[PDB]
C-alpha cells in the first residue's frame, strides 16, 4: 500500500425523528454505522504517522463548518458592510459522535501504541474501515467530551521548531465541568463548577509531564495574552447558547505544588449574543438566551496551550491557555489515524 488522500464518508447513529441539529445533519450526510466493524492487526509492521499533516482533519473541518452554516443561522449576520436581519429560531443543540470511513480501495491505518505523541513511527498498527465516534465539539482552551489517553499524559507538538503554534495536552483522566445558567436578575450570568481537588491534582500531573519536555524546568501558567474573548476565555456552545468563561482560577499557580485550593472552583461565565464566528467570517448576533435552567456537564479530556517565546527561560517556562484553531480540536481525535491506498 501507500499513503494517499481521498474523499471520506461519515457514519452515525442519528435519529430521523430528532429536531436536534446534529441529528438532522447526520441523517442527511452520514450513513448507518457498521454493527460489526472489522479491524486487521498487521503483525510486525512499522508505519509513520503525522497528525500535523493529516488531511482527515481538513475534511472534518469542512463538514463541521457546513453543519453550522446550515443549522445555526443568527438574526443579524454582520459580514463586511452588510447587515443581514433574518429569523433566528432557538434550536436543539447537542453534538453526536461521527465516524469517518474510507471508500473501496482505501483503508484507515490505526496506531495502537499507548504512548504515541502523534508524529513518528508506530509499531503496533491495525487497519480499520472507520474511525471511532467523534463528537464535533467546538471549544477553546479546554477540549470537551473527547477521548482520553490510555496510559500517561501526552504532550502533542509538531516540534519542527520550538516555536510551536499549538500544544495539545491529552489527558488520561476526565475532569467534570458543570456549567449552569440558573432559573433565578441577569439572565446572561452563568458559572461552571469544577472540583478543585481533582483538577489541581491533574494540573499538577500536567506540569510534571511538561517538565519532561522542557529541560525539567519550572512550569508557570499565566492568563492569555491578547485576542478576542473567544480565545481569552473558555468559549463553547451549550444548548445553542454561546458561553464565555473566565478560566483565571483554573490556572492558579499557588494551587500547584497547598492551602484551601481544593473544594469547588466557580468560574465566572457570561452568555454573549454578539460573537465572532469561528468559521470564521464576520460577527453574528443571536437571540437572547432561553428561559429555564440551562445546563451542560462536560468531560475535560484535553488542554490547549501556548508557550511564551522570546522570554528568559533560564529557570521558568511560561504556558498560556490557547486554541482558536478548531483544526487542532479534530487533530486531538484524529491523531492516531491516516488514510492509505491499496
Amino acid at each position: 500500500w501507500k499513503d494517499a488522500d481521498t474523499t471520506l464518508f461519515c457514519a452515525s447513529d442519528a435519529k430521523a425523528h430528532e429536531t436536534e441539529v446534529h441529528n438532522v445533519w447526520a441523517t442527511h450526510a452520514c450513513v448507518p454505522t457498521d454493527p460489526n466493524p472489522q479491524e486487521i492487526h498487521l503483525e510486525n509492521v512499522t508505519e509513520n504517522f503525522n497528525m500535523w499533516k493529516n488531511n482527515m482533519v481538513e475534511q472534518m473541518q469542512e463538514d463541521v463548518i457546513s453543519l453550522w452554516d446550515q443549522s445555526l443561522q443568527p438574526c443579524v449576520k454582520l459580514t463586511g458592510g452588510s447587515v443581514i436581519k433574518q429569523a433566528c429560531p432557538k434550536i436543539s443543540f447537542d453534538p453526536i459522535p461521527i465516524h469517518y470511513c474510507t471508500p473501496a480501495g482505501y483503508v484507515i491505518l490505526k496506531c495502537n501504541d499507548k504512548n504515541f505523541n502523534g508524529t513518528g513511527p508506530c509499531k503496533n498498527v491495525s487497519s480499520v474501515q472507520c474511525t471511532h465516534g467523534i463528537k464535533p465539539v467546538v471549544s477553546t482552551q479546554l477540549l470537551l467530551n473527547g477521548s482520553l489517553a490510555e496510559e500517561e499524559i501526552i504532550i502533542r507538538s509538531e516540534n519542527l521548531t520550538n516555536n510551536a503554534k499549538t500544544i495539545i495536552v491529552h489527558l488520561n483522566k476526565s475532569v467534570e465541568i458543570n456549567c449552569t445558567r440558573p432559573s433565578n436578575g441577569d439572565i446572561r450570568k452563568a458559572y461552571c463548577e469544577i472540583n478543585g481537588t481533582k483538577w489541581n491534582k491533574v494540573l499538577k500531573q500536567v506540569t510534571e509531564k511538561l517538565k519532561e519536555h522542557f529541560n525539567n524546568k519550572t512550569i508557570i501558567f499565566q492568563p492569555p495574552s491578547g485576542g478576542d474573548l473567544e480565545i481569552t476565555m473558555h468559549h463553547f456552545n451549550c444548548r445553542g447558547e454561546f458561553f464565555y468563561c473566565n478560566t483565571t482560577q483554573l490556572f492558579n499557580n499557588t494551587c500547584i505544588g497547598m492551602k484551601g485550593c481544593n473544594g469547588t472552583i466557580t468560574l465566572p461565565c457570561k452568555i454573549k449574543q454578539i460573537i465572532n464566528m469561528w468559521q470564521g467570517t464576520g460577527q453574528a448576533m443571536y437571540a437572547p438566551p432561553i428561559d429555564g435552567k440551562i445546563n451542560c456537564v462536560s468531560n475535560i479530556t484535553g488542554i490547549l496551550l501556548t508557550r511564551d517565546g522570546g522570554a528568559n527561560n533560564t529557570s521558568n517556562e511560561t504556558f498560556r491557555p490557547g486554541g482558536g484553531n478548531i483544526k487542532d480540536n479534530w487533530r486531538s481525535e484524529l491523531y492516531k489515524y491516516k488514510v492509505v491506498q491499496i
Epitope: 499533516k53 509538531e158 519542527l160 510551536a164 478576542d228
Partner: antibody
Framework: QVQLVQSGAEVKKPGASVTVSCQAS????????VHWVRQAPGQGLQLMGW????????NYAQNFQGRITMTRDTSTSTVYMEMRSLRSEDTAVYYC???????????????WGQGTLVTVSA | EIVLTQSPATLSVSPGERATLSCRAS??????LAWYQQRPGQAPRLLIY???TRATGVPARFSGRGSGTEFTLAISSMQSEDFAVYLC????????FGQGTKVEIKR
C-alpha cells in the same frame, strides 16, 4: 502577488507614543502570523514580537513587554503596533514580516514591508 | 538568547569568483536557519530557508550547507547584483538574526 505596505515615517519626542501600521494583500490575511522586527543604527535586526491576525494572539519579547501593543483590523487586513514611552535608542527602522508556518510550527520569514523610519529625539 | 555570529564582518571578493559566508550559532538550531539578502535602504530578501532550500526565484548559484551550529552560504559566481549584505536568521527557538556580512568588490 503577496505584498506588505507599511505606514509613513514618524517623528516623535522622547516620552511620547507612536503607532506603526502594515496592510497586507495578495493572500489570506488570517493564515499568516505577522512579526515586527526593528533595526537600530549600528545594531542588528531584533524581533519585538508577533501577532496571529486571526483572533489574535500576541507574543512580545521581554525587552518590549510593557511598552508595545499589537492589534489587527481583520476587515482592512491591517496590523498595528503601538509603541509607548519612546526613548532615544528606540530610533530605528521598523520592518514588518509575515511568517511561513506549518500546521503546528512557526518557521521563517519570506515577505517584508518596505520598513518604517521612526525618529525619537528632543 | 541564541546568538548568531557571522564571519567575517566584511568579505572582499573579485567579480566572478566564489564567495563563502559563515554563520555560527551559540546553541544548536537544528536545521531551522535561513539566509537573507539586504540592499541599502531596502527590506531583506529571502534567499534560502531550511538551511539548503532556495526560495522560488533565487538563482542556482546560491546554496546553503552545514548543520548543527556551523552554517555556510555559497555564491559560486559573483554578479554585480550579488554584492550586498547577507543576514542569517535562526528560527529554532524564537527569532534572532546575525550582525550581517557585507560582500564588497575586491580590487
Amino acid at each position: 502577488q503577496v505584498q506588505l505596505v507599511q505606514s509613513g515615517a514618524e517623528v516623535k519626542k522622547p516620552g511620547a507614543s507612536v503607532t506603526v501600521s502594515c496592510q497586507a494583500s495578495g493572500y489570506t490575511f488570517t493564515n499568516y502570523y505577522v512579526h515586527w522586527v526593528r533595526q537600530a543604527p549600528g545594531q542588528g535586526l531584533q524581533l519585538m514580537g508577533w501577532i496571529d491576525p486571526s483572533w489574535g494572539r500576541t507574543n512580545y519579547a521581554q525587552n518590549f513587554q510593557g511598552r508595545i501593543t499589537m492589534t489587527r483590523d481583520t476587515s482592512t487586513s491591517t496590523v498595528y503596533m503601538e509603541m509607548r514611552s519612546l526613548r532615544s535608542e528606540d530610533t530605528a527602522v521598523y520592518y514588518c514580516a509575515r511568517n511561513v508556518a506549518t500546521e503546528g510550527s512557526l518557521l521563517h520569514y519570506d515577505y517584508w514591508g518596505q520598513g518604517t523610519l521612526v525618529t525619537v529625539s528632543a | 538568547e541564541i546568538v548568531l555570529t557571522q564571519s567575517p564582518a566584511t568579505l572582499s571578493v573579485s567579480p566572478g569568483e566564489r564567495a563563502t559566508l559563515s554563520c555560527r550559532a551559540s546553541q544548536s538550531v537544528r536545521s531551522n536557519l535561513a539566509w537573507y539578502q539586504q540592499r541599502p535602504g531596502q527590506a531583506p530578501r529571502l534567499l534560502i530557508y531550511g538551511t539548503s532550500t532556495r526560495a522560488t526565484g533565487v538563482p542556482a548559484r546560491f546554496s546553503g550547507r552545514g548543520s548543527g551550529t556551523e552554517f555556510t552560504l555559497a555564491i559560486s559566481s559573483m554578479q554585480s547584483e550579488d554584492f550586498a549584505v547577507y543576514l542569517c536568521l535562526q528560527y529554532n527557538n524564537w527569532w534572532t538574526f546575525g550582525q550581517g556580512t557585507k560582500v564588497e568588490i575586491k580590487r
